[PDB]
Design a protein around this ligand. Structure first.
Ligand SMILES: OC[C@H]1O[C@H](O[C@H]2[C@H](O)[C@@H](O)[C@@H](O[C@H]3[C@H](O)[C@@H](O)[C@@H](O[C@H]4[C@H](O)[C@@H](O)[C@@H](O[C@H]5[C@H](O)[C@@H](O)[C@@H](O)O[C@@H]5CO)O[C@@H]4CO)O[C@@H]3CO)O[C@@H]2CO)[C@H](O)[C@@H](O)[C@@H]1O
Ligand SMILES: OC[C@H]1O[C@H](O[C@H]2[C@H](O)[C@@H](O)[C@@H](O)O[C@@H]2CO)[C@H](O)[C@@H](O)[C@@H]1O
Lengths: 1526, 67
């Protein structure tokens, strides 16, 4: 059916962690195949890789993976297959990796670097776990019960073994771990294997004999089998070691150990003559050791030649200096240190005149000097004649060269004998190891460091035996040349075993790799898995190769390993590459009760009430996605991985901690009788069985054997005494886990709480799906530490049921047989007296223990949380799509957003945002305010967050989500969304308090995802198929477009009105701004597809035309304010954008509006019947603006006075506009005006800026004239098609100018007036007064400004003209001008409003300043430095357009020979938007800010989300889409 | 120093990179599109046998004017 996981990648190709589970591995869940399907019928899993659009990896990017393409192809570690990444600047690419067989798979990405080079990422691994079935019943991995049995203690016959099989089958174990069933070596230790390719001749004789026994265990007792696999060593007496001695490290293969060999055989030669030339052969005095050390001082150390292994032979070099004195001589280097600098001269000879391998160990005299090079330096430094003091000089140098070697020798020897008299003591003098037998040939004074034999080739060899350094790094091969452990005697050896020298591959040891391969695949044919002892000491490449050979034989190989590497990261890396399925954890390692509770806590599960993962505001919601309309397209027989909700965003693949195999006692640790007591066997095994993982135990733990069985010496056989000790309880524990394994699946599905009080340990296992749970109270018996009474156990909203209770008591000591291993007689008494009180009011269960509860007892309770059934998850994950069926792009605003001021509008100031105690209010009243807070909470499982605390303290926030929508119930689809929330929040309130937070975030997240998907479906294709970043920008359109009660865009009705920004531009007269609305109209409404809503705004503002201008402040349609010169031309540009994009958009021209003001500029006749009066068409409105500006306007602001503007001066209200017809430019404004987008009037009474405009942009503005040229070009081609009637234009005198002549006037004079030429020799053809200029190669910011110094100020407004009227610019002039803006005026998120090199540069905006600074006080710096985000949109739109015309590297040959932008241009575009993508990601408001201080510094006064900030970035994506991606 | 397109002016000392597609079997062909008559030169940079950088002579070729 659906077995697909989504693995999202970052911009660097690394997998993205969906949740914080800790250091882990990308493990895929162990699940059975679909009903009646084998390996190969269909892919086991499909990993969906998600690559971000426009990321640097997509540039000629390829996805590599060693996953075979189909089931017929075998797996190869190093054969990777190609996968093409489909590059796009809008759409992410998804590449499927079909997996047909469990194993280890990795993937890396190659791409074209920014240096045009090839680059590769890391290898990222992911493991597909094996499928374990017994006959035809699936065995979940976390329900495995493994019984480890030692072969040589089960009897000498196969039927003697099958009696043991029946015993462990009654205890209901489902897996048996075998110590290796091979022919054992001399010492008969199970791990020193004589012959790897044949089993134990005592019991078996062929592969079919043992294969039938394992298959018999499968069919008879329903038990799987696995063995130990030994890679690190072999027995010291293998007949194949004589034929191939190179399989281990010897004097030929590892020459560095030659020094250690002659020291080991200096002790086997010494330990046999000890008594003759010594005295303390076997005594127990500290002085007795010292005389042996003194015997060591002279008989071995003094007889080993002062060790020339380090020191250069001094006199044998002088002897070989006179010998060759007169051959290759003379030097020339003038860098040879003087003979005064003795230390530096020695190191100079160390690097120049030395033979290969200097300093490192080898033969006796391996380190030597190159003579012809040494004497050549001596002739250059001293004299060419030898007798001239060379013997003194050459010896002085060599003696100084051997100074570090001698001090390296004293530090080595001290560790040789310090390790000796500290080991001989413990070995002999009984401190904790009783074995002070007189030193014999079998037990000498020296533990055998090397195994000696004569080989079949004739020569004598000396292989050593591995072991373990005390606290050394296990990742370092102590037998390799990097370690000096065999020399310094820092090795605890195993004489039973012998080295296995693997190299870099099969080339270094051919026969060893071939033998181990056939040995691995032999056990792989028989058993279901392997067990690896000391896996951390086996090299990675060694373990990788053979485990892959095994999985080719047995595709469902189950790998267990005792893995204790340097850290958890190294543990995960070994699990990643080797494909380890389970890690061994030992419960006997816990020294105290607190250490045991912490070990059990690590492998128990997640906290009770843990948050559930949900796709939120960080996912793409493709409008063309499949959906479980009622969460019903799942069949249990399909065994499909479930999506999170109705939306079919597949289950995310995230790193989870590697699976654990918790062993209450292994075959190497001491018995509970030894470390603790025998009674602890019961509570210890119960705590282990309750962990949500695989469990296991050694044979004899349940049968309370007295002490740990010596794997080397002991020959006794397991007792046939049945049902001893815990065998009855383990039957209960394993049978209980079989009931739980049927439904518990993933890591979020099993929760846990563990408590430790004194000697008691509490375990509460909980299933998060149904509420079923177990409660364990186990009194531990580490020591008999008196009576302790446990307090009253209290469970909230839960009912308890007694299951079972036992006590383990000792009845004397164990029998002493010499033929049969018998355990300690134990009584297993059932307990009673547990009082389970249940309060029918508070629904609280109390549990009181009985006073007869001795140490070593347990009691199990079955528990069930109240309010949770099996059908709860389906009810929460369904119906939300049908509930959003009637939502519109307007109505989604009230479900998701609404600022608190916007909510005060609908609630008359009564409601607002929910106040979270000890935190604050969410940014929005809708779901977005919750999702912005919950995403980090769910990621970290922060159950201690103030919102998490408030959610379980009461149901206030639960009811707040549902009760909000009463304000907007009558709107489209909101009522049905509220009913879904009402029904789900009601069911949640019936749950325990501690479970409300996790379920509250799940309900809100699901409805949020459905509302966000519904938005992408209602929007256009370019948006509803793009990256998270593009969709996040598009969701800002819903944040701004809403219906209100205190304002609107029409004076007679209350309809949808685009707000300027939230929350400070959303209510009353502060919401709608004509300048702001029509700059964002193309991005927020046209790019998204809100065609009808964009028409309403154009028509509504068209009603309020006056002075041939559009009002800045629109008071819905009543008493507005025409203090803007920009609005009318941004408005007429939005009309062109509408007609260009909307199909049949020319119909807008003949739409009739009702102008609320008479044609002649009248007064404020709102109640006067002459308001409605006459109708005007959009075609007429466009012409009315063009002709009124041309004919010369003249007006003083109506209703003038302090009531209008309390700071504007008297002369400031009379603003005007006139067209200089010699150039065609539209001029206008005064030094008391703010008729541009830089509208900041001073208000400081202390700095005397009251009424002084901070940025008075008087005269010809680049934006106004650029939009004028765009409007003229629009109406000219419009008249050519018969959609525009007018071509006449009237002048103040009475003359007429054709629209084409006005268009050509700007075409011939615009660039001449504004461009500041880069050449001073051209400062005559572009109207420039060179006295006042900052930089050249700049298009001026104004023309004929009141203060001429502002004409030549670098401001980001010139790009508005570049975008709307590109014909006004010669390509090479504009490209260089916008390249200066990229280097100078471009901030990280916002565009710098003024050149930092200017003296008026005040980049920090603080509206609350009571200083004497003429600019910074009261925030006059508003547009004199601060970085605005919308200008960044117009900037990069022209930065892309003019770099595509000028720079040839930004162009590439395309299909149909239509030149498309190069990846070099997309790369430069993508880089300039990373700060924008970071901003909208990590912002509580789901948008882009209005303003930013210098260099990305957050401005507190800036509105955190602005309409035209995100709208201008959507303009860029639509440009690239409509022109190149069709 | 051949300009990449007609929009780019000619500079004597501004040289542009061109990657040689190495092969032991196939020769590589690299086109030099010339849009305006004048003096153009080309030289080759490569990795020396000493793993150092080496450069050849500048080789010129003249495109005659159109009269
Ligand atoms: O209810 C009717 C309303 O009518 C009149 O409104 C007038 C204003 O009182 C008057 O000041 C003027 O509005 C101008 C203002 O003069 C001009 O300086 C400029 O103001 C800037 C701020 O300077 C700037 O700091 C910023 O203000 C934001 C602030 O950053 C933000 O953090 C948050 O605090 O919200 C503030 C705004 O509320 O931006 C503004 C706007 O650009 O521009 C204003 C608009 O042109 O003219 C108004 C004409 O109606 C009466 O005077 C008023 O009392 C009445 O209540
Ligand atoms: O002209 C070089 C000069 O520029 C700066 O002065 C500015 C001045 O502050 C502005 O008012 C502008 O309109 O006129 C000058 C333009 O350069 C600084 O003095 C410094 O950058 C430089 O010396």
């Amino acid at each position: 059916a659906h077995r697909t996981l989504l693995l999202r990648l970052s911009d660097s190709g690394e997998p993205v962690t969906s949740c914080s589970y800790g250091q882990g591995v990308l493990t895929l869940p162990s699940l059975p195949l679909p009903q009646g399907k084998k390996l190969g019928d269909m892919p086991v899993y499909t990993v969906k890789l998600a690559i971000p659009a426009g990321s640097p990896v997509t540039r000629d990017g390829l996805i590599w993976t060693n996953c075979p393409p189909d089931f017929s192809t075998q797996f190869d570690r190093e054969k990777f297959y190609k996968k093409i990444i489909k590059t796009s600047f809008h759409e992410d690419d998804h590449i499927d990796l079909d997996i047909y067989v469990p194993g280890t798979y990795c993937f890396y990405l190659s791409f074209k670097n920014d240096k045009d080079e090839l680059e590769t990422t890391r290898k990222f691994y992911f493991v597909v776990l094996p499928i374990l079935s017994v006959n035809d019943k699936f065995i979940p991995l976390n329900s495995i019960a493994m019984q480890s049995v030692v072969s040589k203690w089960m009897g000498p016959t196969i039927k003697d073994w099958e009696k043991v099989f029946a015993r462990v089958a009654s205890k209901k174990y489902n897996m048996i771990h075998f110590t290796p069933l091979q022919h054992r070596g001399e010492s008969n230790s199970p791990y020193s294997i004589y012959d790897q390719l044949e089993f134990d001749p005592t019991v078996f004789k062929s592969e079919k004999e043992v294969a039938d026994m394992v298959e018999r265990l499968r069919t008879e007792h329903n038990i799987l089998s696995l063995t130990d696999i030994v890679f690190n060593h072999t027995a010291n007496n293998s007949q194949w070691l004589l034929d191939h001695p190179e399989a281990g490290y010897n004097h030929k293969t590892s020459p560095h150990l030659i020094s250690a060999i002659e020291l080991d055989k200096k002790l086997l030669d010494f330990s046999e003559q000890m008594e003759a030339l010594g005295y303390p052969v076997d005594l127990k005095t500290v002085d007795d050791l010292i005389k042996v050390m003194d015997g060591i001082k002279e008989h071995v150390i003094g007889e080993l030649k002062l060790w020339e292994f380090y020191v250069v032979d001094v006199k044998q070099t002088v002897s070989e200096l006179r010998e060759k004195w007169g051959n290759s001589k003379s030097w020339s280097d003038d860098n040879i240190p003087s003979k005064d600098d003795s230390t530096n001269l020695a190191q100079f000879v160390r690097d120049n005149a030395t033979e290969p391998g200097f300093g490192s160990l080898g033969e006796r005299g391996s380190n030597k000097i190159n003579i012809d090079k040494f004497a050549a330096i001596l002739k250059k430094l001293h004299s060419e004649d030898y007798n001239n003091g060379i013997e003194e000089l050459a010896t002085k140098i060599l003696n100084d060269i051997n100074l570090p070697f001698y001090k390296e020798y004293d530090d080595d020897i001290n560790e040789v004998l310090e390790q000796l008299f500290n080991r001989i003591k413990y070995l002999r003098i009984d401190d904790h190891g009783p074995k002070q037998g007189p030193i014999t040939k079998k037990l000498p004074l020296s533990e055998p460091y090397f195994t000696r034999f004569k080989a079949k080739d004739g020569e004598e060899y000396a292989l050593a035996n591995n072991g373990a350094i005390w606290d050394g790094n296990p990742l370092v091969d102590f037998a390799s040349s990097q370690s000096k452990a065999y020399l310094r005697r820092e090795v605890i050896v195993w004489g039973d075993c012998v080295k296995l020298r693997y190299g870099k591959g099969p080339s270094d040891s051919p026969y060893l790799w071939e033998r181990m391969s056939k040995y691995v695949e032999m056990n792989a044919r028989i058993f279901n898995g392997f067990r690896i002892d000391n896996c951390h000491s086996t090299p990675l490449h060694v373990g990788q190769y053979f485990l892959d050979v095994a999985r080719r034989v047995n595709p469902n190989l189950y790998v267990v390993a005792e893995l204790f590497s340097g850290s958890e990261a190294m543990d995960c890396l070994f699990v990643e590459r080797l494909g380890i399925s389970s890690l061994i954890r030992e419960a006997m390692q816990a020294w105290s009760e607190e250490e045991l509770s912490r070990l059990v806590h690590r492998h128990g599960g997640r906290p009770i009430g843990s948050y559930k993962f949900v796709p939120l505001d960080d996912f793409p919601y493709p409008a063309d996605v499949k959906i479980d309309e009622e969460y019903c397209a799942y069949n249990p027989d399909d065994h499909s991985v479930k999506c999170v909700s109705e939306i079919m965003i597949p289950k995310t693949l995230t790193a989870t901690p590697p699976h654990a195999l918790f062993m209450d006692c292994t075959h190497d640790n001491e018995t509970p009788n030894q470390k603790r007591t025998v009674e602890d066997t019961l509570p210890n095994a119960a705590l282990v069985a309750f962990c949500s993982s695989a469990i296991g135990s050694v044979y004899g733990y349940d049968e309370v054997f007295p002490q740990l069985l010596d794997l080397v010496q002991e020959k006794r056989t397991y007792s046939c005494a049945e049902n001893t000790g815990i065998s009855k309880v383990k039957t209960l524990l394993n049978n209980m886990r079989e009931e739980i394994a049927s439904e518990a699946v993933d890591i979020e599905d099993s929760e846990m709480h563990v408590h430790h009080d004194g000697q008691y340990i509490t375990f509460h296992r909980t299933n998060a799906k149904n509420g079923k749970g177990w409660y364990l109270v186990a009194r531990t018996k580490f020591h008999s530490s008196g009576d302790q009474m446990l307090p009253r156990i209290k469970l909230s909203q839960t009912k308890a049921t007694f299951k079972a209770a036992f006590s383990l008591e000792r009845t004397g000591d164990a029998p002493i047989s010499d033929e049969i291993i018998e355990g300690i007689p134990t009584k297993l008494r059932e307990l009673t007296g547990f009082d389970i009180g249940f309060d029918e009011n508070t629904k609280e269960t109390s549990i009181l223990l009985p006073q007869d509860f001795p140490q070593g007892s347990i009691v199990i309770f079955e528990t069930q949380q109240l309010g949770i059934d099996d059908s709860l998850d389906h009810f929460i994950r369904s119906g939300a799509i049908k509930a959003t069926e009637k939502l519109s792009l307007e109505s989604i605003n009230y479900v998701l957003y609404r600022a608190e001021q916007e909510e005060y509008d609908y609630s008359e100031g009564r409601s607002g945002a929910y106040d979270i105690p000890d935190y604050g209010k969410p940014v929005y009243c809708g779901l977005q305010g919750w999702v912005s807070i919950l995403r980090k909470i769910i990621f970290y499982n922060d159950l201690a967050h103030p919102l998490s605390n408030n959610l379980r303290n009461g149901h206030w926030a639960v009811d707040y989500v549902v009760n909000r929508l009463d304000l907007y119930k009558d709107k489209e689809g909101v009522a049905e969304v509220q009913e879904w929330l009402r029904s789900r929040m009601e069911r949640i309130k019936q749950l325990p308090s501690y479970l409300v937070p996790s379920f509250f975030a799940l309900v809100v997240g699901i409805m949020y995802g459905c509302c966000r998907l519904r938005a992408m479906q209602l929007m256009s294709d370019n948006v509803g198929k793009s990256t998270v970043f593009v969709q996040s920008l598009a969701m800002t359109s819903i944040q701004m477009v809403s219906a209100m009660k205190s304002t609107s865009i029409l004076p007679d009705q209350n309809i949808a009105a685009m707000a300027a920004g939230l929350p400070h531009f959303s209510t009353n007269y502060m919401r709608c701004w004509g300048r702001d609305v029509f700059i964002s109209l193309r991005g927020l409404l046209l790019t998204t597809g809100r065609y009808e809503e964009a028409k309403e705004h154009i028509l509504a503002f068209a009603k309020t035309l006056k002075h041939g201008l559009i009002p800045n402040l629109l008071d819905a349609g009543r008493n507005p304010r025409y203090n803007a010169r920009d609005a009318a031309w941004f408005f007429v540009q939005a009309i062109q954008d509408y007609v260009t994009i909307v199909p049949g958009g020319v119909s807008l021209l003949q739409e009739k509006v009702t102008r609320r003001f008479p044609l002649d500029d009248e007064y404020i006749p709102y109640d006067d019947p002459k308001a409605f009066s006459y109708s005007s068409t959009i075609e007429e409105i466009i012409y009315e603006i063009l002709n009124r500006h041309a004919g010369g306007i003249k007006y003083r602001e109506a209703n003038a006075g302090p009531n209008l503007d309390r700071v504007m001066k008297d002369e400031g209200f009379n603003v005007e506009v006139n067209v200089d017809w010699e150039t065609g430019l539209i001029h206008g404004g005064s030094q008391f005006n703010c008729g541009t987008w830089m509208d900041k009037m001073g208000e400081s009474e202390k700095a005397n800026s009251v009424g002084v405009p901070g940025t008075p942009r008087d005269g010809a503005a680049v934006e106004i004239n650029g939009l004028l040229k765009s409007c003229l070009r629009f109406v000219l081609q419009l008249s050519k098609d018969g959609k525009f009637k007018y071509t006449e234009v009237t002048k103040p005198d009475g003359s007429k100018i054709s629209l084409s002549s006005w268009n050509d006037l700007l075409q011939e004079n615009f660039e001449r007036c504004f461009y500041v030429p880069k050449n001073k020799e051209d400062d005559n053809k572009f109207e420039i007064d060179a006295t006042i200029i900052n930089r050249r190669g700049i298009y001026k910011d104004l023309y004929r400004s009141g203060k001429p110094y502002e004409d030549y100020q670098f401001r980001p407004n010139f790009t508005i003209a570049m975008v709307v009227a590109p014909e006004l610019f010669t390509p090479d002039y504009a490209a260089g001008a916008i390249e200066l803006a990229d280097q100078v005026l471009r901030g990280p998120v916002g565009m710098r409003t003024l050149d930092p090199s200017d003296y008026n540069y005040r980049p920090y905006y603080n509206n609350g300043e009571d200083s004497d600074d003429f600019a910074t006080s009261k925030g006059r710096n508003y547009h004199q430095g601060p970085e605005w985000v919308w200008c960044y949109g117009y900037f990069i739109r022209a930065y892309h357009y003019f770099n595509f015309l000028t720079n040839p590297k930004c162009q590439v040959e395309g299909s149909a020979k239509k030149l498309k932008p190069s990846s070099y241009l997309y790369r430069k575009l993508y880089s300039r938007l990373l700060k924008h993508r970071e901003w909208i990601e990590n912002s509580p408001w789901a948008g882009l800010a209005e303003l930013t201080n210098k260099d990305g510094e957050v401005c507190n006064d800036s509105s955190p989300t602005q309409a035209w900030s995100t709208g201008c970035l959507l303009d860029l994506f639509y440009d690239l889409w409509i022109s190149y991606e069709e």
